[PDB]
Design a protein around this nucleic acid. Structure first.
Lengths: 108, 106, 84, 101, 68, 75, 81, 169, 74, 93
RNA sequence: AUAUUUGUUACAAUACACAUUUUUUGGCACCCAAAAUAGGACGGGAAGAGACUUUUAAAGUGAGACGUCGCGACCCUCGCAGGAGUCGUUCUUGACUUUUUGGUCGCUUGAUGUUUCUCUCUUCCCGUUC
């Protein structure tokens, strides 16, 4: 069994791909490769704010986020919106799939 | 998992009858008994909404101090209130206790 | 198409010079090549344009024009460019 | 015995054994019995999650899982709790997984 | 001349500590079973870094060493 | 699958950096497909050449995973 | 794959290397394998902090390589047909 | 005709300007001889595509204004444009060069429009404008330009920059 | 030529004691008598002590994973 | 800006100028030509852009202008291990 | 007299194979600390002063180290051809050989990023916000 074959049936669903950087990607999902390479379409990808007296966020993820070209200048918080991001498989940590779909049909 | 006909015994009222009185526990059962039809998948979303909760080994229901169950059954009623409501097109404010019981009873 | 410049300021840097050239030649037409490949300097630069008409115009107008002190000697190229 | 010698069905019986009898049987018995499990990731954030599905790589599907993460700066601590209805978890991040009583 | 795999086959259902590579945390418990990758299962484990833990699954990449 | 080609390097005194910090120098003896490199008369190089340098052992083997770059100081 | 075959096509030409440790090895490529581990000849080295040295021969592990710069004229090479 | 979105869409964005960056756009059928009489409207149709260089040369534009936030744009070629004033707040951080040859910009109108900046542009050409003739025009342009790397092909002389800074003080 | 794992087999049968460096993150180095090994270069060490980087505590007969191995040094 | 085909895989796109993100926070922008099973790809005319530490501090939450130091390296071959995500910049000539 | 359709073969191409040091089932994570009100903040530029440095009172603004492309030049340097030649072949194609301006020095503070240590106020000018 390869559970990645489950993600292949989640196509055309709203999803968050939460990466190893801590970067979170909300978007509509397209075909997922057998290596779990996940390709999305209309995505708003951001970094959470640890509050904690304004403790410094990931320094690499901010640079990687500004360097997508999708971060707009007037965004107050740290976010970026872009079309067509393709994500390598080993970068994914968690995937939050919608509440509506039923697993009993898709997990077979 | 049973390939053979057999008599098996269990308990529908696991925790709540043991905590709360007998008149009310069946009423809390029937608030649920309508609900799992209306909770097609949100049942396991709302029953396991508190992940601290475990089901006892002898028992079936999710054992708890029963406050969120009053919240769960109120949430579950609202899913019944809208699904009965949407088919006949009733406003949620127009729903009254005599209608709400008719949703529960009928 | 190509226009071979000559008699210009060698003291100026290469990239900068190229940029200047581009700036100059944008009024006549679309400059295809920013700077000459040889980059010998001291005047020798081939301003490649899209249209011949534009090139002609440039030749006409910028003959002995003040660019970084000295007057640039404009002239048509002997051989055609590699890009064109 | 190495894996490259076996045939296509012998790998299926091998995976069936490893899931049924083996370390991952802790997760399998946890999936059938509806017992909530505790999972520690490398991140250092612990999820209390019920396991819908699991797999060889240990990546697993959990529903109603609750995430617990604390952070400290100069020994100033705060505990944060986050609830997600549906989770797919990639298995390389996990380290220890225990089955609650 | 014992090798690693027969060494784990000899350590089954014995009390074994396992040191992970991170915090110098060691899980002390009765080993249950191991995989090809040396995944670990433990009963009645205790986490030392003080607590008591009923049953444990330990993934292969995070363990540093295994001792009895 | 394929064996790395060190064939010209062996028996020559070689410096190689172990990890980010480290640099070990020794006479290369043998190697394998993972690049695991066994060498003799190993010495751990440091800032002060005669001082902080200390020999390791008569025979030392290195995991190919910690190997970054391998330079031969030799013909 | 084509990316490795292009590295095999770059043998005997000056190439640049970025190791994931941060250094830069620019020099002539002698050997390359399908594991991407290459050995380079008469190569100028730039440490991560900028200190530059020179060494005659070097062998690097392919897993530690980040990007390789190859002479531009290999762009139109037949691999890309 | 007027600079619409359709025209922009039509424009040849294939041949990239290889001097710097990519996508050397030429709006309408051809930006060179497009004849955009009004200000550059419908700038949003480009949507900051890509030292992104836009050639507007041989066009009717009166004012250098009406831009959408363009992060990429580094080069503006505006030659043969009846520019009068070019005051804006959109293209401020962005842009490395500005070629304004053969336009109608005033010596005072050009100076007024910028309003001054701590740092701006880097390359500027004001040649064939009425203002350049005006007495002390080079000194006034250097004072207005504030920071500058060029002035009509000749760099403001280091000593000239110092004297201009003293005049500003 | 002396293949490296052959050399390790010469550490098994010759009963020579070895010091072994771990990854730079852990901060301890192990030393003991290498008994046997697998294809993955994970080794069993008899009478092993962990030294922080000489007051280290004795370990035992301990299986050590090959992923954390850096050096094996006599 | 640019609209990529709603379903387009790394094979569907060739000669598009891409924007490649690595693990170290630097970016390689250029035309993709080939790629591979493990997703190490070949860029034609590529420029690596980097974020300054002072610039990184500016990026922290409060119009921002970042000075991004970049250097030009032509016809490279990346490594799939380093690659993080890929975005499309432009469409082919 | 009246290019389309159907069948077969090959190539390119998408969906079903691999958790053990060379790419995709992670050596993972941590420096720490800074705004609240009911004319006011915030950014940028210029000037003064304190404290720092240097010389024997007088001079500019935290200090010390790699590179990076630039402002000057008492120097060199001729001036018009990625391409070039050869052979096959017919009106511009293939196969085989030769191999980049900048070569340098100051910077009487280019201009600017890494990395260690220790501890700002006043005045004017220009933008944003209530």
């Amino acid at each position: 069994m390869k559970l990645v074959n489950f993600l292949k049936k989640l196509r055309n669903e709203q999803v968050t791909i939460e990466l190893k950087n801590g970067t979170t990607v909300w978007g509509t999902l397209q075909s997922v490769s057998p290596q779990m390479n996940a390709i999305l379409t209309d995505v708003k990808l951001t970094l959470p704010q640890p509050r904690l007296n304004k403790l410094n966020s990931n320094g690499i993820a901010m640079a990687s986020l500004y360097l997508t070209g999708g971060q707009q200048p007037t965004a107050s918080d740290n976010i970026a919106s872009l079309q067509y991001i393709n994500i390598r498989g080993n970068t994914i940590r968690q995937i939050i799939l919608p509440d509506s779909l039923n697993l009993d049909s898709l997990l077979v | 998992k049973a390939t053979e006909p057999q008599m098996v015994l269990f308990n529908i009222y696991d925790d709540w009858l043991d905590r709360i009185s007998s008149y009310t526990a069946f009423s809390r059962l029937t608030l649920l008994l309508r609900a799992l039809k209306t909770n097609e998948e949100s049942a396991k979303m709302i029953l396991l909404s508190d992940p601290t909760i475990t089901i006892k080994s002898y028992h079936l229901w999710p054992s708890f101090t029963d406050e969120q169950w009053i919240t769960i059954e109120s949430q579950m009623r609202d899913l019944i209130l809208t699904e009965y409501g949407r088919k006949y097109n009733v406003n949620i404010s127009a729903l009254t206790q005599t209608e709400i019981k008719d949703i529960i009873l009928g | 198409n190509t226009l071979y410049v000559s008699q210009l300021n060698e003291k100026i840097n290469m990239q900068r010079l190229r940029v200047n050239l581009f700036l100059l030649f944008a009024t006549f037409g679309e400059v295809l090549k920013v700077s000459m490949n040889f980059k010998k300097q001291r005047g020798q630069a081939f301003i490649t344009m899209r249209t011949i008409d534009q090139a002609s115009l440039a030749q006409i107008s910028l003959n002995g024009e003040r660019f970084f002190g000295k007057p640039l000697k404009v002239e048509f190229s002997k051989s055609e460019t590699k890009t064109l | 015995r190495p894996k490259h010698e076996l045939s296509r069905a012998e790998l299926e019986e091998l995976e069936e054994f490893e899931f049924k009898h083996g370390p991952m049987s802790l997760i399998n018995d946890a999936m059938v019995t509806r017992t909530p499990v505790i999972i520690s990731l490398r991140n250092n954030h612990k999820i209390i999650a019920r396991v819908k599905a699991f797999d060889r790589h240990c990546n697993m599907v959990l529903e109603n899982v609750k995430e617990l993460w604390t952070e400290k700066k100069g020994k100033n601590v705060i505990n944060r709790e986050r609830f997600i209805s549906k989770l797919f978890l990639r298995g390389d991040s996990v380290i220890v997984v225990l089955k609650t009583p | 001349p014992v090798n690693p795999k027969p060494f784990l086959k000899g350590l089954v259902n014995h009390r074994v500590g396992v040191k992970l590579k991170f915090n110098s945390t060691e899980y002390r418990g009765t080993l249950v079973s191991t995989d090809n990758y040396f995944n670990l299962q433990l009963n009645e484990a205790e986490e030392f870094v003080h607590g008591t833990l009923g049953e444990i699954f330990i993934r292969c990449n995070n363990v540093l060493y295994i001792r009895e | 699958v394929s064996t790395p080609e060190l064939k010209k390097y062996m028996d020559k005194k070689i410096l190689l950096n172990i990890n980010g910090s480290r640099k070990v120098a020794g006479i290369l003896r043998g190697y394998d497909i993972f690049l695991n490199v066994v060498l003799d008369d190993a010495m751990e190089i440091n800032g002060e050449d005669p001082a902080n340098n200390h020999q390791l052992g008569l025979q030392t083997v290195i995991r190919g995973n910690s190997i970054i770059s391998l330079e031969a100081l030799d013909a | 794959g084509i990316p490795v075959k292009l590295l095999n096509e770059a043998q005997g030409h000056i190439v640049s290397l970025e190791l994931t440790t941060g250094a830069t090895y620019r020099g002539k490529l002698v050997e390359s394998e399908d594991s991407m581990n290459v050995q380079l000849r008469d190569v100028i080295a730039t440490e991560p902090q900028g200190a530059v040295t020179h060494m005659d021969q070097i062998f690097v592990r392919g897993s530690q390589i980040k990007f390789i710069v190859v002479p531009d004229l290999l762009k139109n090479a037949p691999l890309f047909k | 005709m007027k600079f619409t979105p359709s025209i922009v869409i039509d424009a040849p964005q294939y041949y990239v300007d290889h001097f710097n960056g990519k996508y050397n756009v030429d709006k309408c059928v051809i930006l060179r001889d497009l004849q955009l009489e009004t200000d550059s409207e419908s700038m949003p149709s480009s949507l900051k595509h890509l030292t992104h260089i836009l050639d507007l040369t041989n066009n009717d534009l009166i004012m250098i204004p009406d831009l959408s936030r363009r992060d990429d744009i580094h080069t503006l070629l505006l030659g043969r444009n009846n520019i009068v004033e070019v005051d804006g707040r959109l293209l401020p951080m962005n842009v490395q060069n500005l070629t304004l040859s053969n336009n109608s910009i005033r010596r005072f109108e050009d100076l007024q429009r910028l309003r001054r900046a701590p740092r701006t542009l880097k390359n500027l050409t004001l040649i064939g404008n009425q203002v350049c003739h005006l007495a002390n025009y080079r000194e006034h342009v250097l004072r207005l330009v504030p920071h500058l790397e060029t002035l009509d092909f000749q760099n403001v002389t280091a000593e000239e920059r110092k004297s201009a800074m003293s005049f500003p003080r | 030529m002396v293949p490296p794992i052959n050399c390790i087999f010469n550490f098994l049968q010759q009963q020579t004691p070895v010091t072994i460096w771990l990854f730079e993150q852990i901060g301890i180095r192990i030393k003991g008598k290498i008994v046997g090994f697998d294809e993955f270069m994970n080794v069993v060490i008899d009478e092993a002590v962990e030294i922080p980087v000489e007051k280290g505590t004795p370990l035992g007969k301990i299986l050590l994973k090959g992923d954390n191995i850096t050096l094996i040094t006599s | 800006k640019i609209q990529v085909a709603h379903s387009s895989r790394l094979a569907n796109l060739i000669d598009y100028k891409l924007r490649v993100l690595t693990q170290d926070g630097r970016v390689y922008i250029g035309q993709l030509m080939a790629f591979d099973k493990h997703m190490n790809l070949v860029l034609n005319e590529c420029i690596e852009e980097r974020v300054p530490k002072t610039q990184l501090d500016k990026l922290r939450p409060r119009t921002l202008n970042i000075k991004v130091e970049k250097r030009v390296l032509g016809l490279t071959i990346l490594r799939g291990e380093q690659i993080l995500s890929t975005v499309v910049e432009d469409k082919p000539l």
